[PDB]
Design a protein around this ligand. Structure first.
Ligand SMILES: [Fe+3]
Ligand SMILES: [Fe+3]
Ligand SMILES: [Fe+3]
Ligand SMILES: [Fe+3]
Ligand SMILES: [Fe+3]
Ligand SMILES: [Fe+3]
Ligand SMILES: [Fe+3]
Ligand SMILES: [Fe+3]
Ligand SMILES: [Fe+3]
Ligand SMILES: [Fe+3]
Ligand SMILES: [Fe+3]
Ligand SMILES: [Fe+3]
Ligand SMILES: [Fe+3]
Ligand SMILES: [Fe+3]
Ligand SMILES: [Fe+3]
Ligand SMILES: [Fe+3]
Ligand SMILES: [Fe+3]
Ligand SMILES: [Fe+3]
Ligand SMILES: [Fe+3]
Ligand SMILES: [Fe+3]
Ligand SMILES: [Fe+3]
Ligand SMILES: [Fe+3]
Ligand SMILES: [Fe+3]
Ligand code: NA
Lengths: 216, 221
């Protein structure tokens, strides 16, 4: 975080090791639950980008999640760069990587955050990190198939492929994944295909289903 | 923009008629100057997407410019959506559905939603994001209409002169400049901005060389 000293200067305040301790525990206990996001946002109140990164590599053991977070950060950074075109000539305005803390110093971070007008790089980067965590949660959650729907015009075989791919990426028990495939494949098919599929009979299986809806 | 009740709610306050009148005056007076952009940014501080659209409706009579803003906005909105794909799953009680491009442009979103995004912890700064799109648009407008745009049209060292001529004239046509300025552009800047080898050939032509004669002279240079 940031604190004002008696000179008026805005200076760094380390995130308490007890705040870090609490963050690692939340992750150990609730990893991939949506509850992680609000906790992260509260834990990281007032964070500079460096603070955010301190928090991030404290759970660095989540190699798979970390690569996904980073790919998402890179994407938001590029979008920032897009809508804030650079301008040479001559504090510099931050690029995406400066907001992510990769190409900026702590001093520069404090400088943007407390400038006039201020550029809240801490809040921007926290939002980007939230986008990454949401992606991860969403991909891993059983809830990801409950809401899948075959498009109104979507070819049934395309839908099937998407269905199984989404299911495969979920971290869920086999019993739940089996219940989903047996129930929700036909249940979440579009209006026109559903009708066709139900009329086949309860013993109808995947290949007959795809032939029956082929063309629609 | 956004203000807090004594009862603690973040509510919307319309842009002041004096801020609006100032912005309208800036556009009236500062035609298409680079100066418009910094002013627009100052005047639109804190604006929600609704407020930004309010400012634009006030200067909407500039139809060719509004058309340019529309195309920019549609383009940026389309990229936002590519970067932010729709996610159909349920929204957790402590999450907030992300805005779409059209939500940011204020088209498919409500003031209440805009305020909900803007004041989230941390924000989803839809006012600032939409403001950036508008600014991208304004920069494209000034760059297109300003007589300044042709000045950096320079023939490449290996560019066929006919291609350079096309670029030059296309840029010329799209500018809002007086005829006497455009006459200087065609009669002197075109040669001025030719590459070293073509310029030397062009400058050794007669008093009344026609553009067709120029193209003939510089073919394969
Ligand atoms: Fe914060
Ligand atoms: Fe990457
Ligand atoms: Fe961004
Ligand atoms: Fe701050
Ligand atoms: Fe700024
Ligand atoms: Fe910040
Ligand atoms: Fe988000
Ligand atoms: Fe197939
Ligand atoms: Fe699969
Ligand atoms: Fe069914
Ligand atoms: Fe088909
Ligand atoms: Fe605000
Ligand atoms: Fe106002
Ligand atoms: Fe000036
Ligand atoms: Fe409008
Ligand atoms: Fe969505
Ligand atoms: Fe959130
Ligand atoms: Fe409201
Ligand atoms: Fe965002
Ligand atoms: Fe905003
Ligand atoms: Fe912002
Ligand atoms: Fe310009
Ligand atoms: Fe070339
Ligand atoms: Na980056």
């Amino acid at each position: 975080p940031i604190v004002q000293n008696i000179q008026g200067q805005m200076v760094h305040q380390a995130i308490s090791p007890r705040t870090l301790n609490a963050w690692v525990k939340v992750v150990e206990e609730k990893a991939f639950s949506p509850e992680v996001i609000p906790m992260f946002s509260a834990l990281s109140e007032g964070a500079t980008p460096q603070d955010l990164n301190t928090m991030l590599n404290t759970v660095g053991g989540h190699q798979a999640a970390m690569q996904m977070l980073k790919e998402t950060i890179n994407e938001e950074a590029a979008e920032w760069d897009r809508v804030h075109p650079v301008h040479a000539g001559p504090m510099r305005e931050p690029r995406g990587s400066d907001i992510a803390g990769t190409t900026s110093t702590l001093q520069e971070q404090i400088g943007w955050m407390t400038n006039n007008p201020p550029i809240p790089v801490g809040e921007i980067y926290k939002r980007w990190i939230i986008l990454g965590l949401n992606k991860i949660v969403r991909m891993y959650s059983p809830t990801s198939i409950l809401d899948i729907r075959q498009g109104p015009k979507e070819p049934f075989r395309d839908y099937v492929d998407r269905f199984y791919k989404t299911l495969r990426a979920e971290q869920a028990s086999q019993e739940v994944k089996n219940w989903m495939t047996e129930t929700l494949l036909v249940q979440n098919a579009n209006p026109d295909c559903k009708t066709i599929l139900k009329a086949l009979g309860p013993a109808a299986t995947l290949e007959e289903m795809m032939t029956a809806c082929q063309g629609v």
